[PDB]
Design a protein around this nucleic acid. Sequence first.
DNA 1: CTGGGGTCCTAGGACCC
DNA 2: GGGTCCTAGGACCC
Length: 342
Amino acid sequence: GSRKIIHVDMDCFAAAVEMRDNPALRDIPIAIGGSRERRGVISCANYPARKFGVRSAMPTGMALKLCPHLTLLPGRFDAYKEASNHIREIFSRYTSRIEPLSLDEAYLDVTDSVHCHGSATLIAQEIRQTIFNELQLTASAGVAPVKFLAKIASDMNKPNGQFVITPAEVPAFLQTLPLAKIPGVGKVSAAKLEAMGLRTCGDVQKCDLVMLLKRFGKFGRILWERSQGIDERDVNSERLRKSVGVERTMAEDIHHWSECEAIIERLYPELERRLAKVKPDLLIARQGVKLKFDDFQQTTQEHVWPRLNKADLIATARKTWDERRGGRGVRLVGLHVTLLDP
DNA sequence: CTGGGGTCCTAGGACCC
DNA sequence: GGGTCCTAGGACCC
Ligand SMILES: Nc1ccn([C@@H]2O[C@H](COP(=O)(O)CP(=O)(O)OP(=O)(O)O)[C@@H](O)[C@H]2O)c(=O)n1
Ligand SMILES: [Mn+2]
Ligand SMILES: [Mn+2]
């Protein structure tokens, strides 16, 4: 049919929760990210900091080259987690059809709700307001007939605002929309479809689908469907965690197995505790390890295995350390585990 | 000067048709 | 010629 979707997105989420519990940071540049001593990167940044040009996923070295007086915080999870619990409860009051994406996001299908006389625009306005009133944080909304447009619109108005796209607005909206804003079209593909001349949807709309399944396979279909603004994906509230990882990047590389083993001794207890919260008996499907060398190439060894076992990890890492390092430094060691199927 | 937590997609070989 | 599991890797998102 024609549904009503509401992408809610907390505005620079982890930064906002810091500014509220510490109003001193309200107007001075702040970021959450690992310190440059540790080779970290920026998670999020307040608006005083984005002035300078600091964005998420930026190396901390560069965040300070463009904003020296940047206050760097490590980050507090629950403070973000507890806040993200509340917003989800607030969604619960309006629908049960809630697809949580990350901590600050949520797709909401409201097609079958009469909370605000069946107007998605108010329901969105309500959640944004009632989140503000009880958590003292601001949120932003995107209303659309489908999932990906509701998300694009949530960044449309950006800070403490919303943006609505009706089916009559859609065909014009997609003429000028660049492929890179379509969630799932990141840097590499954006660069590639453009080597073929395709920068906006409207360029793809005049293209052939037979060939787009040649050059891109399945991804060419998804591209083609939304360059057409078709998106059948349903708001699923049932998705579960499939895997639990713990990984670490160290200040200066390591070159000897004894060091790598010393790291594994310390990340295993965290992986145990984390997996305990979900499987108190530790039964799993596969476990494995992950190295990242200095040439940034990354390798994985993982094999079917019944229960989180410390000694098999050290074993498997050691074997990977031997036959795949080629005597390069390694900047990252990590442990992984794939959950059982239920 | 490049995190840490994840998701989904691809592809070859193995296994069992 | 199948499906499906197993494994490794890559693009992508917050
Ligand atoms: N690469 C990344 C990107 C995001 N994050 C995490 O994602 C959160 C919100 O996502 P987000 O993408 O919405 C950013 P937000 O802070 O909310 O800015 P906005 O107001 O424009 O939406 C941040 O608070 C970070 O912890 C990360 O850890 N690594
Ligand atoms: Mn956000
Ligand atoms: Mn978000």
